[PDB]
Design a protein around this nucleic acid. Structure first.
Ligand SMILES: Nc1ncnc2c1ncn2[C@@H]1O[C@H](COP(=O)(O)OP(=O)(O)O)[C@@H](O)[C@H]1O
Ligand code: ALF
Length: 953
RNA sequence: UUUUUUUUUU
């Protein structure tokens, strides 16, 4: 107990590429380096999560005098020792890659082998395919930019050549726009009222200076309070200046937003301010939803990812790019900042404007070669802030007789009872009793307005919604309407936070950080902040993904406070101590220090931005060099990069897809094998954190009806596919029947819809790349068939390639073994999870992702056959003693070594087939006869019972 | 609240 967890956390996957530096020597080497260099820095530990789910973050930064650099590591672990070991490993690998320390020169339980026997006919088919394919048998550039030019659509990056915009010049378009604007300003009463409102905004007093700075400088930073008018006013200022200058058709403005909801809402706001419908002067572009404006004199409110996607076609005809909320420090935002700095360096005429309420303006200006910072004084309306001391003192709230602690630190101005209750309340726990007391006090305030409560995640949001709906006062929908605000609730529900509620009804919005910034809900008067931010951690050396609830930053608190006091005076209720608030950090750590970088590297290569190392070095905070090395090695070994680090056709195709490169490679292979529909639906399932099966209150495992969806296939992916098929059938008959079906069978309609949208988008992208429509014909799956099913079997075999190295072997009950026989458990939400002594037809499973919890869990399990594992879910196949064939250095199979060598010879054949498919996507269904024979023999190897010849199991 | 679901992709 807990030794299995320690060994699982200490597992190392990639010590080979980091100079042979691993967990069990990293700390010793780091201590040697510290003693030699007189480095006095010591580990600092951040307790993470509640008492029952406590984890740790370990931090350590070492300054290198030789490089004039501070090398930092930021790692997590189930306990202090594991977290510190991971942090030392990260920092030592960084020092190794930075050529500060030497490569490692020193030095440092087998499974029951599994019988695999093939039919003589199948062996002959394999041999003939080897003979046919002659397989050996083992015995910089910058983004294009241009000023506006006639007969060109900026947003589509293409010529117009249609309609009557052929002889229409930009000068005539400017004249028409100027005349229309003047006519509106002279006649439209609603437009005049909106200008009257806009002139009273705090940013309106500085419009002339803002426009002067924008005109005179290529890059300008704008800092103003939340709700001052940056987003809704700067683009309008620039466009109106151009239009009234007589150069209206020479303007095209990009305004990037961090959130889809924020982009859409602000675009709607600007459109209704201009008294015109979306698509005339204001447009937006988010995922699955785009309303494009006119090609000239327009504003497009997109997200950063949408802009990065548009970057491939160039930015011809773009005059101004406005980046919002540069404080978010997202990986896409940092990418965009690097691209934009290079672009303004190349093209002096392009204008880039950065605005944020909470930024280090000096840091950003130093990054942008000393650029103006324009400060917008004042606020629209004041916001009153209270802290935990104030809330307890004014609620007279004592914690119920239930079970550096900054809740013990308090000022002497507060009552002894208040400090007692504060010390008795726990920091890591969210008290629903305290929240209810605060809500009752707000009710007693007799002040109309919506309440916005910031909760870190789905579980807390819906637990609080259940608690409040079971309450007599807050369960009355005639008085209170509680609305979730999550990125994975249905989009109609996401909208409903903006719609007004009936008279006499108070709106309560329980939200994650989507409602944190950039949105204006017009009736928010009260903001309740729990001060917790949900973070997703990933440890590279053991492939563990962990969800952490950490303390939010002062930037996050100020942005959340800024949701109120925009249209009327507001209040902010911060549910943390004043001591805790002062203890908080200014900003959260950037995602660039904790996320994998292979997708970013693929985007770098797609946009022809040069070397990955140089590009990432030019960042605001350059990423860890060991992470850069891991990304490059991954892309090179998946062959998205040529031996000269150049993008291959496969690399280009995968760079254009919004999924992981391994999933994209899996989907290309599935297109070759005729199951692209299933491969796309399963890649969409593998790329979402939304849950397919809804678990009821107190449901620690799936229900019988939910489990029966997998039938006899023993696969979460098959269960998902069957659910998707039935949900499509019931959706074709109507939305109400769709909702009834999901609520009956225990599905999540939002998950079904997002999975379908992502799958459809992948299929359209494949069609655009040139793959034929015949290779993506939908195939129905009958999970109730107990036997073989060739299409589903090849699909599950391709899951092994698309989910590598996530192969686990069942031991008993929930216990499984991951790579190198590390203990793990089956996740509670899997169809394969059961309390009884379940026996599976095969013990080998492929799973989506590996989660670190109180125990290591495997999730999204799919039962696969030994031949499928050998062919696709492995990279190394070796001959061990007693003629036992070993795959991935830990899985033993009792198969003939000659047969194993023959089957392993097909892996380069599959690689060459993928290369051929990417070379000519249109002819993948009519290949040469060797490759057609390879496809057929791979199908015959991937049938479920291909390795069951003469074997009972 | 007995951690299944921070955010983002023409
Ligand atoms: N949908 C809306 N309904 C009512 N008022 C709004 C709306 N959107 C914006 N406003 C008002 O316009 C002002 C400007 O908002 P915005 O430009 O988004 O500010 P910033 O970009 O500085 O956060 C806000 O203070 C708000 O009062
Ligand atoms: F600068 Al903003 F909403 F775009 F505050």
């Amino acid at each position: 107990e807990q030794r299995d967890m320690n060994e699982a956390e200490a597992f190392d996957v990639n010590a080979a590429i980091h100079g042979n530096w691993t967990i069990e020597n990293a700390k010793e080497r780091l201590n040697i380096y510290k003693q030699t260099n007189n480095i006095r820095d010591d580990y600092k530990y951040t307790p993470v999560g509640p008492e029952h789910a406590r984890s740790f973050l370990a931090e350590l930064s070492i300054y290198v005098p030789a490089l004039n650099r501070t090398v930092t590591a930021r790692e997590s672990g189930s306990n202090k020792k594991s977290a510190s070991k991971s942090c030392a490993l990260s920092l030592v690998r960084q020092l190794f890659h930075l050529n500060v320390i030497e490569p490692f020169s020193g030095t440092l339980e087998q499974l029951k082998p599994y019988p695999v026997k093939l039919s003589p006919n199948l062996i002959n088919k394999i041999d003939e395919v080897i003979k046919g394919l002659d397989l050996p048998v083992v015995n910089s550039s910058v983004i294009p930019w241009a000023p506006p030019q006639a007969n060109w659509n900026t947003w589509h990056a293409c010529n117009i050549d249609e309609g009557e915009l052929a002889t229409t010049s930009i000068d005539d378009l400017s004249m028409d726009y100027e005349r229309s604007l003047r006519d509106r300003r002279q006649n439209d009463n609603e437009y005049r009222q909106f200008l009257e409102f806009r002139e009273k905004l705090p940013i309106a007093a500085m419009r002339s200076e803002i426009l002067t700075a924008i005109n005179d400088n290529p890059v300008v930073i704008i800092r103003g309070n939340t709700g001052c008018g940056k987003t809704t006013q700067i683009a309008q200022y620039i466009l109106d200046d151009y239009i009234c200058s007589g150069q209206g058709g020479y303007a095209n403005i990009y305004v990037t937003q961090p959130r889809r909801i924020s982009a859409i809402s602000v675009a709607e706001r600007v459109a209704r301010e201009r008294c015109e419908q979306l698509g005339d002067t204001v447009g937006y572009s988010v995922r699955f939803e785009s309303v494009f404006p006119r090609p000239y004199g327009a504003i497009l409110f997109c997200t950063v990812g949408v802009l990065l996607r548009k970057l491939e076609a160039g930015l011809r005809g773009v005059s101004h790019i406005i980046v919002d909320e540069i404080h978010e420090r997202d990986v896409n935002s940092d990418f965009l900042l690097v691209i934009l700095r290079d672009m303004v360096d190349t093209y002096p005429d392009l204008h880039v404007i950065l605005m944020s309420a909470t930024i280090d303006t000096t840091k950003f200006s130093k990054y942008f070669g000393i650029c103006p910072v324009l400060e917008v004084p004042g606020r629209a309306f004041p916001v009153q802030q209270f802290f935990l001391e104030d809330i307890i003192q004014m609620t007279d709230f004592v914690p119920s007789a239930e079970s550096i602690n900054y809740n013990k630190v308090c000022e002497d101005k507060y009552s002894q009872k208040t400090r007692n209750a504060m010390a008795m309340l726990s920091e890591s726990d969210v008290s629903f009793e305290l929240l209810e007391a605060l809500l009752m006090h707000i009710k007693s305030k007799n002040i109309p307005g919506a309440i916005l409560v910031f909760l870190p995640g789905w579980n807390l949001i819906f637990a609080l919604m259940k608690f409040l709906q079971n309450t007599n006062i807050f369960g009355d929908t005639s008085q209170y309407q509680i609305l979730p605000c999550h990125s994975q609730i249905p989009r109609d529900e996401q909208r409903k936070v903006f719609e007004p509620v009936p008279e006499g009804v108070t709106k309560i919005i329980l939200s994650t950080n989507i409602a944190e910034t950039s949105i204006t809900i017009d009736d928010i008067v009260f903001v309740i902040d729990i001060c917790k931010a949900r973070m997703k951690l990933f440890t590279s050396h053991n492939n563990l993904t962990s969800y952490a609830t950490v303390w939010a930053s002062k930037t996050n608190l100020e942005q959340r406070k800024g949701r109120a006091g925009r249209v009327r005076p507001g209040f902010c209720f911060t549910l943390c101590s004043r001591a805790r608030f002062q203890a908080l950090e200014d900003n959260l750590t950037p995602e660039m220090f904790r996320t994998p970088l292979h997708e970013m590297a693929l985007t770098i290569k797609l946009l022809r931005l040069g070397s990955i190392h140089h590009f990432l070095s030019k960042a605001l905070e350059p990423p860890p060099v060991d992470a850069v090395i891991e990304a490059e090695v991954l892309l090179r070994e998946m062959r998205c990069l040529d031996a000269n680090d150049e993008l291959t056709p496969l690399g280009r195709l995968l760079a254009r897809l919004p999924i992981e490169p391994r999933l994209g490679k899996m989907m290309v292979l599935g297109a070759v094998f005729g199951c692209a529909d299933l491969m796309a639906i399963m890649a969409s399932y593998s790329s979402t954190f939304s849950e397919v099966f809804s678990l009821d209150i107190g449901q620690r495992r799936l229900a019988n009806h939910q489990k029966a969806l997998s039938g006899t296939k023993c696969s979460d992916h098959v269960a998902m596919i069957v659910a998707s098929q039935m949900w499509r059938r019931e959706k074709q008959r109507g939305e109400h029947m769709e909702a009834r079906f999901c609520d009956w069978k225990g599905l999540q309609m939002s998950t079904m819809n997002v999975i379908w949208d992502a799958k459809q988008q992948l299929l359209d992208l494949l069609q655009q790349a040139g793959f034929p429509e015949e290779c993506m014909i939908s195939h129905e799956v009958d999970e109730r068939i107990d036997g073989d099913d060739p299409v589903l079997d090849v699909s599950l075999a391709l899951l092994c390639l698309g989910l590598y190295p996530n192969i686990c072997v069942h031991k008993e009950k929930r216990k499984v073994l991951t790579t190198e026989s590390k203990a793990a458990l089956l996740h509670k939400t899997s169809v394969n999870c059961s309390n009884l002594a379940v026996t599976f037809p095969y013990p080998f499973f492929v799973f989506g992702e590996k989660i670190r919890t109180r125990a290591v869990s495997c999730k999204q399990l799919s039962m696969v056959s030994p031949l499928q594992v050998i062919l696709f879910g492995s990279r190394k196949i070796d001959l061990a003693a007693n003629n036992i064939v070993r795959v991935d250095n830990w899985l033993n199979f009792d198969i003939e070594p000659e047969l194993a060598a023959k089957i392993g010879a097909l892996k380069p054949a599959l690689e060459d087939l993928i290369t051929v498919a990417c070379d000519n996507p249109s002819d993948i269904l009519r290949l040469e006869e060797p490759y057609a024979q390879l496809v057929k023999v791979v199908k015959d190897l991937c049938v479920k019972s291909a390795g069951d010849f003469g074997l009972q199991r």
